Enzyme design. Sequence first.
Site, mmCIF file in Angstrom:
data_model
loop_
_atom_site.group_PDB
_atom_site.id
_atom_site.type_symbol
_atom_site.label_atom_id
_atom_site.label_comp_id
_atom_site.label_asym_id
_atom_site.label_seq_id
_atom_site.Cartn_x
_atom_site.Cartn_y
_atom_site.Cartn_z
ATOM 1 N N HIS A 38 47.143 35.150 31.903
ATOM 2 C CA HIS A 38 48.457 34.672 32.320
ATOM 3 C C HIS A 38 48.439 33.238 32.851
ATOM 4 C CE1 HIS A 38 47.844 35.119 36.718
ATOM 5 N NE2 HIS A 38 47.271 36.281 36.457
ATOM 6 N N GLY A 140 47.293 31.735 43.797
ATOM 7 C CA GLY A 140 46.190 30.964 43.257
ATOM 8 C C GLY A 140 44.843 31.667 43.224
ATOM 9 N N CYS A 142 43.874 34.293 41.454
ATOM 10 C CA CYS A 142 43.485 34.950 40.213
ATOM 11 C C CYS A 142 42.284 34.253 39.602
ATOM 12 C CB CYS A 142 44.649 34.957 39.229
ATOM 13 S SG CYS A 142 45.911 36.111 39.734
HETATM 14 C C1 LIG Z 1 52.677 39.725 43.561
HETATM 15 C C2 LIG Z 1 53.621 39.474 42.376
HETATM 16 C C3 LIG Z 1 54.950 40.202 42.645
HETATM 17 C C4 LIG Z 1 53.878 37.962 42.235
HETATM 18 C C5 LIG Z 1 53.040 40.007 41.058
HETATM 19 N N1 LIG Z 1 52.832 41.455 41.116
HETATM 20 C C6 LIG Z 1 53.362 42.268 40.202
HETATM 21 O O1 LIG Z 1 54.091 41.901 39.287
HETATM 22 C C7 LIG Z 1 52.991 43.730 40.348
HETATM 23 F F1 LIG Z 1 53.545 44.237 41.463
HETATM 24 F F2 LIG Z 1 53.404 44.365 39.235
HETATM 25 F F3 LIG Z 1 51.668 43.843 40.435
HETATM 26 C C8 LIG Z 1 51.667 39.398 40.690
HETATM 27 O O2 LIG Z 1 50.642 39.689 41.305
HETATM 28 N N2 LIG Z 1 51.659 38.600 39.614
HETATM 29 C C9 LIG Z 1 52.807 38.195 38.792
HETATM 30 C C10 LIG Z 1 52.238 37.563 37.525
HETATM 31 C C11 LIG Z 1 50.714 37.443 37.716
HETATM 32 C C12 LIG Z 1 50.404 37.980 39.121
HETATM 33 C C13 LIG Z 1 50.015 36.978 40.023
HETATM 34 O O3 LIG Z 1 50.845 36.256 40.565
HETATM 35 N N3 LIG Z 1 48.704 36.955 40.339
HETATM 36 C C14 LIG Z 1 48.157 35.998 41.330
HETATM 37 C C15 LIG Z 1 47.071 35.155 40.662
HETATM 38 N N4 LIG Z 1 46.887 33.927 41.165
HETATM 39 C C16 LIG Z 1 47.540 36.780 42.514
HETATM 40 C C17 LIG Z 1 48.621 37.482 43.374
HETATM 41 C C18 LIG Z 1 49.538 36.433 43.975
HETATM 42 C C19 LIG Z 1 50.020 37.166 45.220
HETATM 43 N N5 LIG Z 1 48.791 37.936 45.611
HETATM 44 C C20 LIG Z 1 48.036 38.100 44.515
HETATM 45 O O4 LIG Z 1 46.961 38.721 44.513
HETATM 46 C C21 LIG Z 1 51.284 38.409 36.681
HETATM 47 C C22 LIG Z 1 51.192 39.930 36.907
HETATM 48 C C23 LIG Z 1 51.166 38.024 35.203
#
Ligand SMILES: CC(C)(C)[C@H](NC(=O)C(F)(F)F)C(=O)N1C[C@H]2[C@@H]([C@H]1C(=O)N[C@H](C=N)C[C@@H]1CCNC1=O)C2(C)C
Lengths: 296, 300
Positions: A38, A140, A142
């Site tokens: 992503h 950030g 991920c």
């Molecule tokens: C938390 C949020 C509601 C935003 C979302 N969650 C759900 O959509 C779910 F609830 F379905 F999981 C979510 O994590 N993402 C939305 C988007 C990526 C991912 C994402 O932002 N990843 C971050 C990587 N840097 C790490 C996150 C940031 C906050 N704390 C973390 O660890 C993808 C699933 C493609």
Amino acid sequence: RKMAFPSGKVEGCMVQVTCGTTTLNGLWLDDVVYCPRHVICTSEDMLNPNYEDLLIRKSNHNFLVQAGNVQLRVIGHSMQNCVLKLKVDTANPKTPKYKFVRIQPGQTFSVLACYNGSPSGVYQCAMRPNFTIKGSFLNGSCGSVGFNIDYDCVSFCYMHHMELPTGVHAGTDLEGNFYGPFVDRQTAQAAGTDTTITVNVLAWLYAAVINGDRWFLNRFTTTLNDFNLVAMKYNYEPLTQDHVDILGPLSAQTGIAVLDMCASLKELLQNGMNGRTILGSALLEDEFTPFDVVRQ
Amino acid sequence: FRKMAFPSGKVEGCMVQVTCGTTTLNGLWLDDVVYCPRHVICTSEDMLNPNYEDLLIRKSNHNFLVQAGNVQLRVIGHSMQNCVLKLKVDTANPKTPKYKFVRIQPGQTFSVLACYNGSPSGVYQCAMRPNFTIKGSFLNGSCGSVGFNIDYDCVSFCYMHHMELPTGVHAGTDLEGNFYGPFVDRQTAQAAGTDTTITVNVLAWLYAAVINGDRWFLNRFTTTLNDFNLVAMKYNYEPLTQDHVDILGPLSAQTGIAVLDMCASLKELLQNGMNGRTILGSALLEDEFTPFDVVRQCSG
Ligand SMILES: CC(C)(C)[C@H](NC(=O)C(F)(F)F)C(=O)N1C[C@H]2[C@@H]([C@H]1C(=O)N[C@H](C=N)C[C@@H]1CCNC1=O)C2(C)C
Ligand SMILES: CC(C)(C)[C@H](NC(=O)C(F)(F)F)C(=O)N1C[C@H]2[C@@H]([C@H]1C(=O)N[C@H](C=N)C[C@@H]1CCNC1=O)C2(C)C
């Protein structure tokens, strides 16, 4: 203590990956950078991304990879399940001996939390029975990875992708396959009910006996089925015969039969600690594996 | 909310093995000096009542074997500073980080890199207790393991491990060989004093709970330092100082809970306990997060 592995071998592999406005971490091993796919999503893509379509539109130069102050030239790219593999100019000279492993619930590992390609901290954790991690991850984070180290070989088992509504975390192995029934898509999803890792609690109780505490033992035993009937009323994972076999060495070393330790756990669940601690904890610890116990 | 340690890579490259006769422990290799506990120059029997002055006079460079991985480092000089031995070696560590030696205060936290035979084994986060011990995890051969903090590429070494006390807690020195706490490097009966809880850190951890959406313990009440400190002494909590309040200021502004508002919550928790409820999933009040620790983790 629950300890993490020394993180130096993984720190030398962490890099920054930026595509458009989105930046996260990558794992640089030999001449490949691994990162969550992503990274190729903008904000309008998160709800319903078509990754095949997003990726076919990218060139190598759309991926900015930075290892410290050095830019790495991307010369190829490819998608494997939910992970992007960026082929770069240069083999990472700090690549350790490593392998990729997919772990099972109850297994422990160390996490090196990173932002912008630089490490922020390290902690130990476990894969929960519901295939989530009780991590500490911010925006950030991920592309941060989880790992064990065995005889100087790093086994990478986890790469971070997302946070679920209860604050727990979900991610993939290093072949890009999610742990659990989650997808890298910002759509409604939630962790299943989470249970305690019974086999780990029992190993930790055996560790307490090896450490010289016996106050929680009792004169009872139990059948396996009666133990599971009771433990499931406390949201403990059922104990399988494979778990019983796994604890055999600890049972031999302490002289306490596994089903006798199960009777002790049943009583601990019924009574609590009455102000005591076990190995310095007022809670029944379930993120320490039978393998971890023997190895410390 | 996780108990996080610093990344340990900069320190791992400094750990070596030091052997003097039958006694082996860990050493810290920075430029061309190896630092380790002075009791390495002791036989098992010496450790019961050592005369370190005399034992060091009798030793020469050839009595010390230093091993960095597969490579022997030749010792070309030796001296003592307080309870630390300093071994000058023929080769400067090419992996020496930017570093400082610092002495920390009770209640401050640091990461420990546990080492055996010169080889890093694990890393975990610790606090210097008010009774100057640390609740570590250290086995035989762990001496010379160090504790540290990192600030922007600079490693601040603050602890070097020497001993385990009968309650299973641990005692060591700073890197200048000055003990933390009323302990001596002799195998003689000594004990940890009665410990207290690090109040300013519990408050920091309550702010972390609020930041993380755990808010049930908040109440309408406020208190005073004097009133709070009277209940603090009652429950074996470190008296709260005006310095602690200003140090909590930033967390107080990030959450909108004034510091004196949060002290009233802790006061209430201390008297009535919890109604079985949890805070950040924890049954006890945690005191090994500093306010800086909470800011770092909650801001990355
Ligand atoms: C938390 C949020 C509601 C935003 C979302 N969650 C759900 O959509 C779910 F609830 F379905 F999981 C979510 O994590 N993402 C939305 C988007 C990526 C991912 C994402 O932002 N990843 C971050 C990587 N840097 C790490 C996150 C940031 C906050 N704390 C973390 O660890 C993808 C699933 C493609
Ligand atoms: C625990 C023991 C009863 C042996 C003793 N303790 C006390 O004498 C005390 F009670 F006084 F402290 C003690 O620790 N030592 C005795 C001897 C050194 C030190 C020591 O062996 N250090 C080890 C270094 N590798 C680390 C220890 C090993 C077990 N776990 C640890 O951390 C010196 C004080 C000179």
